[model samples]
Target: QRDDSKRIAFLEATVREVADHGFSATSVGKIAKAAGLSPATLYIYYEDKEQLLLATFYYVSDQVIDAALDSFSRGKDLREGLRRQWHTLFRIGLERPELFRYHETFTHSAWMTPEIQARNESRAANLLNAVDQGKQSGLIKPVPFPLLETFMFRPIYHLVQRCLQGSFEGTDEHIELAFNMAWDAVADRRNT
Candidate 1:
């Protein structure tokens, strides 16, 4: 039946609740209340809070991945492709800080089952392969693939963290500085 509309609405509410209150702290009852539904309705859709967290992780991860891939499809060069990814990453984190932080928190939570880990690891490897293509094309530095991904991603994550915490009121210069720092860190600058 089309009753999935209610179920998806409930799931959307859970996403926000889990994002706002880390998985360990978010209660099903709280999510139910927030969604204007009974706690029992949650069990009808999801087995429990742990399952709900994993579901939210998939939802947000897919969204982040799709946004990056969509933008990359429009770029002409490897560096342009990577910059498109960087801009998308920054925008997602800034627009949905709670979801971003939820990812950071529950990614290593005890509730993350091996099934979730393996699934996410495979999805992550796809992104690594994309980054590796850039390195091989000489658009990015030839660091260890994982290290290169870290160098590109960590700064943007921290950048959003600072913006979320109100640590930087922000100026064009702040963003330029951050983006330029990332460019210089990985861009092949030896020839020029």
Candidate 2:
């Protein structure tokens, strides 16, 4: 599932199928057909349905992570860096709803294996370390990683979900408003 033609097709088809039906009841037969490949071809790449599903989850989630990380670089100011990442995430929600749907769903499912988690954590090391350093230097709140994550990303995720559900708008003003709220939650404004 490393970004080949067939792999991309399979992953896209997998996200649509998984988002619609959930992994437990997703149809590999339909996924193969949707990808314009046969089940036999899929089998040559994966051992079975479970393996394919796991790969799909990893690929799609990593795609999101890497996309956000594109705007985050070392030595970047934490505020602007997070703002850029926030915009990337917001655009991703609008542009690739299916990927986010698959991500949010599989994240809470039994399919979230330890290996997958460790891999993701390692992949986000640069950005994660930046925040930890912020905390160390007194720019960020002295809280646990989960609280940092909750303050930094969870609201954007929820609002995106609401927008997708036709209850909210992702306008420029609303985006700034939400970003400021998230920032204040983690930013040690006492020094500012």
Candidate 3:
């Protein structure tokens, strides 16, 4: 049990360190120091930097993907479901800015392996299914999935990024406007 907590602490520290300093600069020594563990002890948990980085990626990804799944499951309808997902993810971003930055870095970097990509894609399948339902119900535009994603999430992504970078001071009003605008951009007017 104690070892589990230590491992969690290591991963959390690693995530923050990697977010602050890019992957190449985030040495195992730095992570161990940040976690208050010795380098040898860090090696006992992870073989090397690559293994630790992958662990960090998976840790953060699970938090994000699980939150989205839980939010989506609690919604009663398509629009509501999307809003739930959006709100949950945005909240996570604000609460764990380092985790969000780590996720974004892993996603856009060449370090992201095919296996990791496939796993992340699978986690999002349910949300995609909800999107399909929205289209069938005429609540969403009958457009390609990528385009639909762009319309629905691009603004939220930008808002989260800006907030993380300290460029935007987010407020409840801004959050509500983001959701409203994203919904408007994708919602079918004929169905309303």
Candidate 4:
């Protein structure tokens, strides 16, 4: 319907504006103008710039991560679960560049409230629980979540960059290699 379409347009414009200029520099005026709608229309869709920003991040993140976590199941082995998560996120990231870009950019900015992250992170709940399970089972290092996250996804992000910026394609062999590297980095390796 036209109603949903206009609201959706505002959110998409918000992503483009925020991705380009970031928080503080972004506002309803800019987003409205970018969306080709007046500020009043944006007000109808959202009460204020803050709500607009939070809503944009909320729906956009949900759209991407919702799909990203689609193929994943915590019941699988750690490697398989992580592999599915990695591949699906990478696939979703490539498909929805704007949404994912906004997620990456605005996520660290001050606009990302604790409420937003608390709710948004729920998308990865099963994955997080999987890691928690792994840690308790001594399959993953009990080092900390931060370490596991960095090693697990930073390398995939690097490969994403490589595919986009350089003439590199993450072939199957190297994808597995990267997965193996991530697995090695976080998996418990202590002798019993």
TM-score of each: 0.82, 0.92, 0.89, 0.85
Clashing pairs in model 3, backbone N/Cα/C closer than 3 A: none
Q: Global lDDT for candidate 1?
A: 0.74
Q: What's the TM for model 1?
A: 0.82
TM-score of candidate 3 against the unseen true structure: 0.89
**C-alpha root-mean-square deviation, each candidate:** 2.7, 2.0, 1.9, 2.5
User: Candidate 3 lDDT, tens digit per residue, 9-73?
Assistant: 89999998989998888899899999998999998899999888888898898888899888988
- The parts of candidate 2 lying over 4 Å away from their true place are 1-3
Name the lDDT value of residue 158 in candidate 3: 79
Candidate 4 lDDT over residue span 1-192, tens digit each: 998899999999998988788777887899999999999888987999888887888878778667656666642677787887777766655555667678778777777678777786687787778788989787899877779879997676667767767666766676777778888989888774
**Per-residue accuracy of model 2 over 1-192 as CA lDDT, tens digit each:** 354877788888999988888887777798898789899988777778888888888888788889888876522688888988887888888778888888888889988878888888899888888888999887898899999889888887888989888899998788878888898899886657
Clashes per candidate (backbone, < 3 Å): 0, 0, 0, 0
Candidate 2 local distance difference test against the native: 0.84
| Error at 163, model 4, angstroms | 2.2
Each prediction's whole-model lDDT (CA) = 0.74, 0.84, 0.85, 0.78
Q: Is candidate 1 or candidate 3 better by lDDT?
A: 3
Across 128-184, the per-residue lDDT of candidate 1 in tens digits comes to 676677677767777875676566778888888888789974454676577778878
Candidate 3 scores a C-alpha RMSD against the true structure in Å of 1.9
Ranking by lDDT: 3, 2, 4, 1
- The C-alpha stretches of model 3 lying farther than 4 A from their native spots are 164-167
